[PDB]
Design a protein around this ligand. Structure first.
Ligand SMILES: Nc1ncnc2c1ncn2[C@@H]1O[C@H](COP(=O)(O)OP(=O)(O)OP(=O)(O)O)[C@@H](O)[C@H]1O
Ligand SMILES: Nc1ncnc2c1ncn2[C@@H]1O[C@H](COP(=O)(O)OP(=O)(O)O)[C@@H](O)[C@H]1O
Ligand SMILES: Nc1ccc(S(N)(=O)=O)cc1
Ligand SMILES: [Mg+2]
Length: 1723
């Protein structure tokens, strides 16, 4: 890299700040005349005549202006002279503009027209405007001007339904008032703070137009912030490639074109410059400089000059005087009034208009305080911001209405309000500047503004500007006000802070990045056009025209500064930057680097509040504050009144600052001017600086100093010491009241126990007694509850339940309340864990559960402490000791099985050549894991456990066991179970083409349906299944032989046993252990797993011996892993995500710049977005297509088969993505391209980490939480899901290593740092899912009594772990006795619950038996509570409406997710469905399924994920409906039962109860029905009996339409029924009555049931039913499948005597309207 040079930075800089002039000479216009007065020199320049109207230079009227821009212009008939040249520029082009004009010329309306244009392209046809589509930024230099603008602009655009809102000050992470607004108005340094925050593209993404008002501020010491701002923005336009319009508004000053360059303005098309001949009113300006320095006489001289100047106006004229003190307005107004009453008493009577009128108006307003009463009767008045109230806005009135004759006012009036005067006289021009620590000349920006108020636009002809100042070196002002003071760049002054900001953002990563950034600065353009002025020689410039040396030297110098102060780690060699937490905080809280060093140096855990106050005063933003003599006395008084001792700071500036702050909190009235100005300064800085110290110390875990610092933050905010009364924080509560309660030695906590009457009776003030009670209960108060379960001997899982215990009030609490959860050691010295909890208003009084892990150490202490502290409220916290007194730590886990460094095992150890073949073509030798394992699995016929990290090759370890089975047995059968369906389908693909193609042995994959699955188990050598599918088969293992005689049983990913749905896995694996040892032909168990801590427990459970148990440590992983965990201390997920964007790219380029990359993101929407970001970042880096490793031409043939539109675009750029909205085809395509090498990067959603057969070199996990709409919260990725993600970063054949970067919220970092490197512990949750499996065992009669239930548990993993980690399973005791006790108390509850729910019967306490409800739940695999609710909610008159409600309330649909902002989506659907729901809470999955079910019936296409959810719903719908039939028929109800069967078919075909049966046929629309309704065809029976020529002539056909419908009626069941009553003649009461039903189809043709709008491929089902229609009674029932010919018998019992009238029913569960009816009689 290039050599660098350390720079004398202080030399290169412009020391004079805004006052600096590289102006040299100064030419005056034609009026030159100088009128000396010995004591002071006078200089005049005359008003300018107005330039001539050019050829076709007319003034455009609003009439001609576009009809949509008319609004916001009532109050205007025509356009200004300036505004005419710019109408095309502003409203007809999107070109960047730079406008220069006299202040007052009307540049603002030009900015307004530009706004209108951006609004112009959001007109939305009928709907008036697209308010939520865009945003405009208006950057103004003064807070007073901003509020002025929000006012004016707010009126204009109110007719557009558009909102413009203020946003400047101390707004840290602003509220949703910025998300609602469309025009943001603010100051530079505000906007800078916002766009530094890392999460910024949420405020700025929508921003289409930003406006820089008074951009000459560039010249000021605030100048850099503008440069920083614009450089930052411009660079972003390049990155996102989203065009943003820049508009500059400046005053007529030199260098304007350099500024236009800076703004990327086209000199030909966007530069508009208007010299001072374009003023609103022509200006007669007068400048006077006091020659002599007699300072007392100075005021006397100065006040004499104002005197005579005012006199030359009197009766008809109006004067404005500007001075520079809140109190100087009063002095001056009275000083002149007395002056002109003792110096020849020149008439104030000469002032009051007429001879004595309007004097009564000025007297009728005289009843107002603040020395205004004294001036108003006369001709004088005053205006200042400082504490002036409504009077301020009334002096404004009378001046504007021309009653007030002489107004002297502070500068803020020039910005705050548009009231101009005929003549303006600026007095003195000196200002006390706190940060400079002295008196200096005021800003060039301020002078211009106020002196631009000379002459009222509609009532004046000439304006008179008088400028009184020092003669000494202030011809500078002539330069300013006559187009001659040049605009320079002040960047060097603020370089290292400005650099640091970008570094923290990720915008610059190295000196090179930096040096490029500098090129965006106005600094760069000036150094070019004026190199000598900036210390560059003419010779350097010609040799280095792009200033590559200087910009690197500049950067290098500032880099060393940030390094010295530890804001940034920088090495001179590579030139790379690393960001530190110190520099991160620095940038975020806007504090200079030198301060951060001081804090880093002085802070320490044991800091006292005394030393704390000391430290704050060493802040470098105070480095200029001195202690003046004229204020030493008053400081001494303050020091004696303030509470915190100030050591030996004595009369140093440190002491001054320290007590100034204390005085502020004590609310001490101050007296000394300047001393007040100083106080204001350190107080506004005090929030940030403290909050910064808080974060520094929070992060280091310093418990005590964290508490001190947060409290100090709150004292400054709430202006009260910590000892005072919490009630003071209520600002609407009489301050004498609070003083009364304070002086009582009374503890605040005791106020909660008193009522309004007792309160007053103790304050001795019975009036306020009731309103205090109101406030006490408004005060934030939380209850904390804790639950503990130890994980290892080093970490415990803590479940904190916070519960709000107060009344909410949006005018007191706002929309939320922030807290900090702090968990600390016994000594309360260390913060062990911490996180930020946010109580949103909507969910106040709602339960909040917070989970997290904490470290524990060898000899445990009694307790830890959880403290929950308000972020804003003083004396507002809640503490909770977490006792360890009864804590039993789990047993020490055994070491990992050692990795023997055996020499690698070649494929030749496998003998069989048909075997070796499917391996030899792949890899040369076996990894150290497979070699070590081999011997035991391929040679032995016994049980074995393998525990290695994912990516280690355990799959083929399992395959070893399978080869042996095929070797040892001809048609042997092995069962293989993976916990995930997407994994099941992955192995089946691998194994089918491995075992049925290569080895010619049938390989099968189980499905939902029982009958067809039974068949597959039969013909299969290799069986593949998820645990749930295998459970419903093996549940009846007695009745099924094929389950019993299986040779081999492989369990993969057995660590998932500790996850959700872990129970079912554990139950089946135990069922195999039970069976195997119960038939004496031992089944071989082979279990594969991630590295376990407690593998001994698993092996002993599954029959493995220690030796044949292979649990390796994660470091054993064949491809070594490089893990990096990157925390983000950002709580708001959307923000966290957005600020992870740049770090994702930067990670690719660092860790895997060439090799492939997978990025996981939490959602489908994120998947598309992150991809697009990577592209745009890439193209901005000038790379464009560095992730495409083929040519675009090569891809076209594949991308032709894509319809997504956008991954077509992204893949073309080398980046793909994956979610579940993509077609299975679209997925396969993308994966293929990735494995091939064509694309380097795919972004996949978290859900697809299980369904991906793709490996990268680098895996990036972007955030680790997903939103769960049910509990309105974000929840963590299961560790299982993350272990998997990381496994994707291994490619054994191509990389020397795998790399993983996890990006997570900071509160999560420490958790990942343990459970990724170390082995994993696992527990059972069988006990929390114990009912359904017991209920099934009692049905199968494996559990015949209570003892058998205890015996059954002895085969489970649960049984092993209860002894090893008792507190996890809440075994309050320890071992041996408590164990038998707890087992028996567990079986007791479950049987009780099952008995109470009608599922089982308990007889003699010991014995159990299945009941009806229990039989139906075991059969259909339905949770027992579902059928409890089914039998509880189904009556005699339930119809298909109530049936849907009941079925959707199934416990099965509980797990249906509610995603972010679907509550708005579901709310819409509800007001669009046939059957309305009452009180339907839209975070309830049941409410969701209910609507999603109607939408499916109503053939509605909707959101992608909703159709995707509908699929998971329908997938369980059938078994649920069938269950309902069973219950209604078990209860003898006729009506509901039949309607329930209708539901079964109408679900399958997706149609309603009275929808035309014509909808069963493909391609038919709702209009095709009425062209058959009128025609005479309203049935499917009709279209089958009419000839073919007449059939296709009916409606519109195609060749492929005829093909689909033909095959439809080749499977539409043809029905005919014959029946006889056996012994029809001889039948009596109480005797059996047999009805023999004959069934046969004539189709002969059969096949898969066609129901296009149904995700499952289901089979035909039929119910034959007998009932009494008259009395609503179901008499007999039988379900079957046709098989072409069938004989169904079903008998019942006869009534007392006579003959009855019955009905015979024949219903389908699949097709609509095949149903037959028959009336018959017996006896
Ligand atoms: N001896 C070997 N040499 C090189 N590559 C191998 C070897 N054995 C397996 N592989 C490959 O390594 C990849 C990872 O192996 P595998 O899928 O078995 O991981 P695992 O450790 O079993 O965990 P999981 O199966 O849960 O991902 C597979 O794609 C496989 O093809
Ligand atoms: N077409 C117009 N008709 C009447 N008044 C105008 C017109 N254009 C601008 N003005 C007035 O000129 C005054 C000063 O102009 P402003 O828009 O504040 O820009 P600037 O002061 O930055 O030049 C404003 O009070 C505004 O009302
Ligand atoms: N300021 C801050 C925000 C969030 C977090 S954390 N640890 O909850 O993510 C810490 C500090
Ligand atoms: Mg595996």
């Amino acid at each position: 890299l290039a050599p660098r040079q350390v720079l004398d930075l202080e030399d290169l800089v412009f020391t004079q700040g805004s006052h600096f002039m590289a102006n040299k000479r100064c030419q005056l216009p034609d009026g030159s005349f100088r009128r000396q007065r010995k004591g002071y020199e006078e200089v005049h320049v005359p008003a300018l005549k107005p330039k001539p109207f050019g050829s076709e230079e007319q003034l455009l009227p609003v009439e001609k202006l576009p009809k949509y821009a008319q609004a916001g212009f009532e109050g205007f008939k025509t356009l200004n002279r300036i505004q005419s040249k710019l109408y095309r520029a502003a409203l007809e082009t999107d070109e960047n503009l730079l406008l220069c004009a006299p202040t007052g010329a009307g540049k603002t309306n030009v900015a307004l027209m530009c706004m209108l244009r951006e609004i112009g392209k959001h007109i939305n046809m009928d709907g008036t405007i697209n308010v939520d589509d865009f945003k405009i930024i208006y950057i103004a230099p003064m807070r007073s001007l901003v509020q002025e603008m929000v006012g004016s602009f707010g009126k204009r655009l109110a007719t557009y339904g558009i909102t413009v809102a203020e946003l400047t000050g101390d707004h840290q992470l602003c509220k949703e008032e910025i998300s609602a607004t469309q025009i943001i108005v603010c100051t530079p340094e505000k906007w800078d703070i916002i766009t530094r925050k890392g999460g910024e593209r949420t405020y700025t993404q929508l921003v289409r137009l930003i406006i820089l008002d008074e951009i000459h501020l560039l010249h000021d010491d605030r100048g850099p912030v503008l440069e920083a701002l614009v450089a930052r923005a411009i660079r972003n336009i390049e990155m996102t490639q989203e065009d943003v319009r820049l508009i500059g508004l400046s005053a007529t000053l030199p260098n304007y074109e350099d500024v236009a360059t800076f703004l990327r303005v086209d000199p030909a098309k966007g530069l508009f410059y208007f010299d001072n001949s374009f003023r609103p009113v022509p200006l007669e300006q007068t400048y006077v400089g006091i020659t002599e320095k007699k300072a007392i006489k100075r005021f006397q001289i100065m006040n004499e000059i104002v005197y005579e100047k005012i006199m030359e106006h009197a009766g008809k004229n109006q004067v404005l005087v500007f001075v520079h003190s809140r109190k100087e307005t009063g002095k001056t107004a009275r000083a002149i009034r007395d002056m002109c009453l003792e110096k020849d008493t020149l008439g104030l009577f000469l002032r009051e208009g007429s001879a004595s009128t309007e004097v009564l108006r000025t007297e009728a307003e005289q009843c107002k305080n603040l020395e205004l009463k004294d001036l108003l009767p006369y001709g004088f008045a005053i205006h200042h911001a400082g504490m002036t109230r409504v009077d301020r806005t009334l002096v404004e009135d009378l001046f504007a209405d021309k009653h007030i004759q002489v107004l002297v006012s502070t500068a803020t009036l020039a910005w705050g309000v548009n009231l101009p005067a005929h003549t303006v006289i600026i007095k003195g021009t000196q200002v006390y500047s706190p940060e400079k620590g002295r008196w200096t000349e005021l800003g060039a920006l301020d002078i211009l503004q106020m002196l631009g108020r000379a002459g009222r636009p509609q009532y004046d002809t000439k304006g008179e500007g008088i400028l009184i100042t020092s003669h000494g070196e202030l011809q500078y002002y002539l330069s300013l006000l006559n187009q001659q003071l040049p605009i320079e760049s002040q960047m060097v002054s603020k370089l290292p802070d400005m650099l640091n900001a970008e570094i923290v953002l990720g915008n610059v990563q190295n000196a090179k990045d930096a040096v490029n950034w500098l090129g965006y600065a106005y600094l760069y353009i000036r150094m070019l056009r004026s190199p000598t002025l900036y210390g560059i020689s003419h010779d350097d410039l010609k040799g280095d025209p792009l200033l590559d040396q200087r910009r690197l030297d500049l950067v290098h110098t500032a880099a060393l500064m940030l390094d010295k102060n530890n804001l940034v780690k920088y090495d001179k060699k590579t030139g790379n930057f690393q960001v530190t937490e110190l520099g991160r905080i620095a940038s975020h809280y806007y504090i200079t680097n030198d301060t951060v060093q001081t804090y880093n140096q002085l802070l320490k855990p044991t800091l006292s509040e005394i030393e704390l106050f000391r430290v704050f005063s060493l802040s470098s933003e105070f480095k200029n504050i001195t202690v003046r003599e004229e204020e030493k006395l008053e400081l001494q008084k303050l020091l004696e009144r303030v509470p915190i001792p100030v050591k030996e700071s004595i009369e140093e500036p440190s002491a001054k600052i320290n007590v100034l702050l204390q005085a502020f909190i004590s609310q001490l009235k101050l007296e000394g001017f300047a001393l007040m100005a100083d106080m204001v300064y350190v107080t506004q800085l005090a929030g940030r600086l403290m909050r910064a110290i808080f974060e520094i110390v929070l992060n280091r875990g310093w418990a005590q100093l964290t508490d001190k610092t947060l409290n100090l933050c709150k004292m400054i905010d709430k202006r009260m010491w910590q000892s005072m009364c919490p009630l003071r924080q209520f600002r609407k509560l009489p301050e004498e009241v609070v003083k009364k309660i304070e002086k009582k030695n009374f503890p605040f906590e005791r106020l909660y126990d008193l009522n309004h009457n007792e309160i007053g009776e103790l304050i001795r003030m019975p009036k306020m007694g009731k309103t205090i009670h109101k406030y006490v209960h408004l005060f934030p108060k939380l209850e904390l509850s804790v639950h503990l379960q130890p994980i290892t001997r080093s970490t415990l899982k803590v479940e904190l339940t916070i519960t709000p215990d107060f009344q909410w009030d949006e005018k007191v609490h706002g929309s939320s309340e922030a807290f900090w959860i702090l968990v600390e050691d016994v000594d309360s010295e260390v913060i062990l864990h911490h996180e930020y909890f946010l109580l949103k208003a909507k969910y106040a009084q709602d339960e909040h559960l917070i989970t997290f892990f904490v470290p524990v150490f060898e000899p445990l202490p009694p307790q830890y402490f959880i403290r929950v502290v308000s972020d804003r409220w003083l004396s507002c916290e809640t503490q909770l000791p977490v006792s360890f007194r009864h804590l039993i730590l789990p047993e020490k886990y055994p070491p990992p099985t050692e990795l023997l460094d055996l020499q690698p095992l070649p494929v030749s150890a496998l003998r069989n050549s048909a075997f070796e073949s499917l391996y030899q073509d792949k890899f040369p030798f076996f990894n150290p894991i497979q070699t070590q394992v081999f011997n035991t699995v391929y040679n032995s016929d016994d049980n074995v456990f393998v525990g290695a990290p994912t990516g280690s090759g355990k799959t083929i370890c399992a395959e070893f066991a399978i080869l042996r089975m095929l070797l040892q047995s001809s048609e042997g059968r092995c069962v293989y179970i993976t916990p995930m369906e997407a994994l099941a389908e992955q192995v089946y693909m691998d194994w089918y083409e491995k075992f049925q193609d290569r080895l010619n042995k049938k390989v099968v994959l189980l499905t939902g349906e029982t009958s067809t699955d039974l068949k597959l188990l039969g013909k299969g050598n290799i069986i593949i299944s998820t645990p749930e599918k295998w459970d419903i088969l093996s549940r009846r293992w007695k009745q099924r032989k094929n389950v019993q005689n299986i040779n081999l049983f492989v369990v993969d990913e057995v660590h998932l046993i500790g996850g959700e749905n872990g129970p079912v896995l554990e139950v089946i694996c135990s069922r195999m252990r039970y069976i195997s040892s119960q038939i004496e032909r031992p089944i071989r168990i082979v279990a594969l797993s991630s590295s376990l801590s407690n593998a001994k427990d698993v092996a002993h459970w599954l029959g493995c011996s220690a030796t044949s148990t292979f649990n390796f440590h994660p470091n054993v992983r064949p491809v070594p892993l490089e893990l990096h965990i990157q925390g983000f201390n950002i709580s708001h997920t959307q923000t966290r995500l957005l600020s992870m964007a740049k770090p994702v790219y930067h990670a690719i380029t660092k860790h895997s710049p060439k090799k492939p990359v997978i990025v996981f993101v939490p959602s489908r929407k994120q998947t598309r977005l992150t991809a697009i970001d990577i592209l745009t970042t890439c193209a901005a880096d000038i790379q464009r297509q560095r992730f495409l490793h083929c040519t675009e031409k090569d891809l076209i043939p594949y991308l032709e088969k894509l319809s997504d539109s956008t991954l077509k675009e992204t893949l073309l750029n080398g980046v793909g993505y994956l979610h579940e909205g993509l077609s299975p085809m679209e997925r396969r395509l993308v994966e293929q391209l990735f494995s091939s090498g064509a694309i380097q990067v795919v972004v996949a959603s978290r859900s697809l980490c299980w369904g991906m057969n793709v490996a990268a070199h680098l895996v990036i996990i972007m955030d680790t939480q997903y939103y769960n709409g049910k509990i309105h919260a974000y929840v963590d990725y299961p560790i299982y899901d993350v272990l998997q993600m990381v496994g994707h970063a291994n490619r054994p054949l191509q990389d020397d290593e795998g790399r993983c970067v996890i990006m997570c919220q900071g509160s999560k970092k420490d958790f990942f740092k343990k459970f990724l490197y170390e082995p994993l512990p696992v527990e059972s949750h069988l006990d929390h899912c114990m009912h359904d499996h017991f209920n099934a065992e009692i049905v199968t009669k494996t559990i015949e009594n209570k003892q058998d239930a205890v015996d059954y548990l002895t085969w489970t993993f649960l049984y092993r772990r209860m002894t090893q980690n008792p507190n996890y399973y809440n075994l309050q005791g320890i071992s041996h006795r408590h164990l038998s006790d707890h087992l028996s108390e567990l079986v007791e509850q479950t049987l009780s619950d099952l008995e109470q729910s009608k599922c089982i019967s308990i007889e003699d306490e010991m014995d159990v038996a299945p009941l009806n409800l229990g039989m139906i739940a075991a059969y259909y695999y339905i949770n027992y509570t579902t059928i409890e609710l089914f039998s509880m909610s189904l009556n005699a008159k339930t119809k298909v409406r109530g049936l849907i409600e009941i079925i959707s309330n199934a416990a099965e649909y509980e797990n249906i997710p509610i995603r972010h902002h679907e509550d708005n989506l579901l709310r819409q659907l509800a007001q669009k469905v046939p059957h309305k729901l009452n009180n339907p809470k839209f975070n309830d999955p049941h409410v969701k399924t209910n609507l999603l079910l109607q939408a499916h019936l109503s053939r509605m296409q909707l959101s992608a994920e909703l159709q995707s959810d509908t699929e998971e719903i329908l997938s369980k719908a059938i078994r649920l409906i069938q269950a309902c039939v069973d219950v209604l028929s078990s209860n003898g109800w006729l009506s509901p039962a039949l309607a329930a069967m209708e539901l079964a078919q109408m679900v399958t075909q997706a149609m309603w109860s009275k929808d035309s049966y014509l909808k069963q046929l493909p391609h038919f629309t709702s209009e095709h029905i009425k062209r058959c309704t009128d025609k005479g065809v309203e049935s499917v029976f009709d279209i089958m009996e009419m000839e073919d020529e007449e059939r296709n002539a009916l409606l519109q056909l195609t060749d492929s339409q005829i093909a689909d419908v033909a095959r439809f009626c080749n499977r539409y069941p043809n029905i005919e029924l014959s029946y006889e009553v056996v012994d029809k003649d001889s039948i009596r009461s109480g005797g059996p009555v047999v009805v023999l039903v004959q069934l046969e189809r004539e189709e002969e043709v059969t096949g898969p049931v066609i129901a296009p709008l149904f995700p499952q491929k289901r089979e035909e089902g039929w119910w034959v039913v007998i009932g009494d229609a008259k009395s609503n009674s179901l008499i007999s029932i039988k379900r079957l499948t046709l098989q072409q010919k069938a004989k169904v018998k079903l008998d019942f019992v006869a009534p007392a005597t006579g003959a009855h009238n019955y009905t015979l029913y024949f219903m389908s569960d699949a097709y609509m309207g095949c149903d037959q009816e028959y009336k018959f009689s017996v006896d």
